[PDB]
Design a protein around this ligand. Structure first.
Ligand code: HEM
Ligand SMILES: C[C@@](O)(C(=O)Nc1ccc(S(=O)(=O)c2cccc(Br)c2)cc1Cl)C(F)(F)F
Length: 464
């Protein structure tokens, strides 16, 4: 017709009654059966266009990539973000900062030391810290959160920290606080009613204070770098950004500034820590529930890699089962069910519907990741979803946990390295033991807002 169809919204409240609050993804799936793959929803007064199923997602994100390359900024994000980096940036500001970040985040994008070497050092440090637990019951939340944060610390400041260093503990405290705030179920009420942000500013003020603390901490590092930076010899992301700024002195306007560097660094810490941490925490929980899966991974680790050397990225192609398990964890868990909000760059005609410039687009990653035809029994954890009859790795165009198109995760290659290297290192050195027993523990995702998190669990890391 003209505009995508949808349920008639109620005045002021919008479509909140149909969407709900607990499971947003199931509501979008039910609405798609009534309104089709392209439908309109109202988050208060804000019109949102939801894309359900692979065909609609692939046509928008890949075929009309540039048109759907914009980032939709919700009321809370708008108030909690003073200055943009990469995540909430748009236009030429986003295009330049993203292109720089992608080139810098390549394996050999920051001088002599590789991204892999930084992850490999962290994987070795992770094992040493799990060894300190003395095979006693523990909540892995803290230890599994330390490694991805330290990888970004090693990428931004060229040096990792001891899991006891106060400045590292402070940085993690601000990141965990911000995630707890963003993952609080009553937060979407601010997006449905942007007026409530003015009457109840306590939420966004706390996010602003933690971001300002992180920005100022990063500012100390950029000054230390400016003091000892050697041009022609970069060691990290800051060094690469400062020399890009030197190349930008001619044609002064510049998208690359000390301010934009602080914003990009906090974005990389925010988007790169909890995503990887939660996936690792969920992976270990799923490995406890399925010890037969864990045993087959350990068989591959013992045969391809030994016990006398650390795992590397070259081992992955020779390890189809382990690669399938990693892919299955990401596919099953559906970490970001609706990804990050998108926005249309210009007025476009999509599926015989007119979507005007700046309209917020919600990509249902669940509809792709949990496709019934591509993954028979999609609500069940099964490495066979990424395996053929012979046990060889079976790729899927439906594997979109990092989303797709122009806005695809900048840390896709990094997260892949971290997930593979950390999990193989843990299972090479330790056997996972549950105090509750495999039958008793629940692995069903706890969807509270716009992120899937595992339930609380404890486990023993027994050395092999
Ligand atoms: C398993 C771990 C991870 C998952 C599942 C994940 C997932 C995602 C998803 C779904 C998006 C939204 C893409 C979109 O807008 O459609 C995203 C964006 C982003 N992620 Fe990741 N991510 C992960 C790890 C990381 C890491 C380690 C980094 C650090 C380099 C990172 C940096 C980013 C950035 C900077 C963006 C914004 C991209 C942009 O607006 O252009 N992510 N990620
Ligand atoms: C700096 C800030 O932009 C921020 O931290 N934002 C942010 C961080 C992580 C994600 S995430 O999608 O990686 C995510 C979100 C919740 C739970 C998990 Br697990 C992962 C999304 C955002 Cl907008 C802030 F908002 F604080 F200002």
């Amino acid at each position: 017709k003209g505009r995508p169809p949808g349920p008639t919204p109620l005045p002021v409240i919008g479509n909140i009654l149909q969407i709900g609050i607990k499971d947003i993804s199931k509501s979008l799936t039910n609405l798609s059966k009534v309104y089709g793959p392209v439908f309109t929803l109202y988050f208060g007064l804000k019109p949102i266009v939801v894309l359900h199923g692979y065909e609609a997602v692939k046509e928008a994100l890949i075929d009309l990539g540039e048109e759907f390359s914009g980032r939709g900024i919700f009321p809370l994000a708008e108030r909690a973000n003073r200055g943009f980096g990469i995540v909430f940036s748009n236009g030429k500001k986003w295009k330049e900062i993203r292109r720089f970040s992608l080139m810098t985040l390549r394996n050999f994008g920051m001088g002599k030391r590789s991204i892999e070497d930084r992850v490999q050092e962290e994987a070795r440090c992770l094992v040493e810290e799990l060894r300190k637990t003395k095979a006693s019951p523990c909540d892995p939340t803290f230890i599994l959160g330390c490694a991805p944060c330290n990888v970004i610390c090693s990428i931004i400041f060229h040096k990792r920290f001891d899991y006891k260093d106060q400045q590292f503990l402070n940085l993690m405290e601000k990141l965990n606080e911000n995630i707890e705030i963003l993952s609080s179920p009553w937060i979407q009420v601010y997006n449905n009613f942007p007026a409530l942000l003015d009457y109840f500013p306590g939420t966004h003020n706390k996010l602003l204070k933690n971001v300002a603390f992180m920005k100022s901490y990063i500012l100390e590092k950029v000054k230390e770098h400016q003091e000892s930076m050697d041009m022609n010899n970069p060691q990290d992301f800051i060094d690469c950004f400062l020399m890009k700024m030197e190349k930008e002195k001619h044609n002064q306007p510049s998208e690359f500034t000390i301010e934009s560097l602080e914003n990009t660094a906090v974005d990389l810490f925010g988007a790169g820590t909890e995503t990887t941490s939660t996936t690792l925490r969920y992976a270990l929980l799923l490995l406890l529930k399925h010890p037969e899966v864990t045993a087959k991974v350990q068989e591959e680790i013992e045969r391809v890699i030994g016990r006398n050397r650390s795992p590397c990225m070259q081992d992955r192609s020779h390890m189809p089962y382990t690669d399938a398990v990693v892919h299955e964890v990401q596919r099953y868990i559906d970490l970001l069910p609706t990804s990050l909000p998108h926005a249309v760059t210009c007025d476009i005609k999509f599926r015989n519907y007119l979507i005007p410039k700046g309209t917020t687009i919600l990509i249902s990653l669940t509809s792709v990741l949990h496709d019934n035809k591509e993954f028979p029994n999609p609500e069940m954890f099964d490495p066979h979803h990424f395996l053929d009859e012979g046990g060889n790795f079976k790729k899927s165009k439906y594997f979109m946990p990092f989303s797709a198109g122009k806005r695809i995760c900048v840390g896709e290659a990094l997260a892949g390295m971290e997930l593979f290297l950390f999990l193989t290192s843990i299972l090479q050195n330790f056997n996972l033991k549950s105090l509750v027993d495999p039958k008793n523990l629940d692995t069903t995702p706890v969807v509270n807002g716009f992120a899937s998190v595992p339930p609380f669990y404890q486990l023993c890391f027994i050395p092999v």
